[PDB]
Design a protein around this ligand. Structure first.
Ligand SMILES: Nc1nc2c(ncn2[C@@H]2O[C@H](COP(=O)(O)OP(=O)(O)OP(=O)(O)O)[C@@H](O)[C@H]2O)c(=O)[nH]1
Lengths: 175, 76, 76
């Protein structure tokens, strides 16, 4: 029985950036335990409803280690929506967002849905990346952008639901 | 080299085409395998977590018991 | 004619060389995916235990307060 769709999503980005909390907040875990640190992969499921239908989201969170290079391509290649995630507390994370965009373009599929996620927007006092400058990156590359906080719990649920709507609207187009 | 180029371009025309068709075949299996391996690891990751959580749930209600008594003797 | 044959052979060559190198990669995939899968599953296993372990140590030691820090309430 239910669900009645399966979107496969991916979280990618620099380490430190809080990819993994951003997940843990969406999937609603009561706990901190993860294998990201040690292994470099972790995974979470959440079904949501959008305009009435069940939508199973499988969310992979990748951390680059070259150790599992092959497997993590498999995730790129098979991913329906991927979130690029920087820390607004840290520039190079933001600078690299271009670099990742490479990978995504190079390792991943030709129509994938894409979303730049400016994380930790919660801590303004340690802000190095202007939002304005954040949006411009996004607009340049014609992709959606969103500022977030895994800890204040800001826009994480919205970031996903937004990406999930974007995936579905595309698929419903191929009726 | 009119027959040499008319003939060789047919060999190179098939060569580039041969691999074209071969590429799709090599790539198509490399996707079927990846899906299979997604579904396998989705299952494992779900297991590792599922197990580790019930370890924690229990660890929870043992410390929750001791903070019930630990504070009460600590009061006076 | 005898002119045009100097185009196909020096670009289709950058083509076939490019594709040849692809399959070389796509060939080594199945094995790797498997190779990696083993290493992941092991690592999954080992970490899983180390995690369920740590949260068991702390279920017994927290319970030994209900055995050796509740009787100090019975002793004092
Ligand atoms: N203030 C603040 N700190 C955050 C936020 N998100 C993550 N962090 C911190 O950033 C650090 C790394 O978070 P992770 O989720 O592990 O980062 P990651 O990129 O997903 O994975 P790693 O490679 O382990 O860093 C942790 O110390 C978090 O507490 C945030 O939104 N706001």
């Amino acid at each position: 029985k239910t669900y009645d769709y399966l979107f496969k999503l991916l979280l990618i980005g620099d380490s430190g950036v809080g990819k993994t909390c951003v997940l843990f907040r969406f999937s609603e875990d009561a706990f901190n335990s993860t294998f990201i640190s040690t292994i470099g992969i972790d995974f979470k499921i959440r079904t949501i409803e959008l305009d009435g239908k069940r939508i199973k989201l499988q969310i992979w969170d990748t951390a680059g280690q070259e150790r599992f290079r092959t497997i993590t391509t498999a995730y790129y290649r098979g991913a329906m929506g991927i979130m690029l995630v920087y820390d607004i507390t840290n520039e190079k994370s933001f600078d690299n967002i271009r670099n990742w965009i490479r990978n995504i373009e190079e390792h991943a599929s030709a129509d994938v849905e894409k979303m730049i996620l400016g994380n930790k927007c919660d801590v303004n006092d340690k802000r190095q990346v202007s939002k304005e400058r954040g949006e411009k990156l996004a607009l340049d590359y014609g992709i959606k952008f969103m500022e977030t906080s895994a800890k204040a719990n800001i826009n994480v649920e919205n970031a996903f639901f937004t990406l999930a709507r974007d995936i579905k609207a595309k698929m419903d187009k191929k009726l | 080299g009119y027959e040499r180029l008319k003939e060789e371009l047919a060999k190179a025309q098939r060569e580039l085409k041969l691999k074209d068709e071969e590429c799709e075949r090599l790539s198509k299996v490399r996707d079927q395998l990846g899906q299979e391996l997604e579904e396998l690891t989705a299952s494992l990751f779900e297991e590792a977590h599922k197990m580790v959580r019930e370890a924690n749930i229990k660890q929870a209600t043992a410390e929750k018991q001791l903070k019930e008594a630990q504070g009460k003797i600590d009061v006076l």
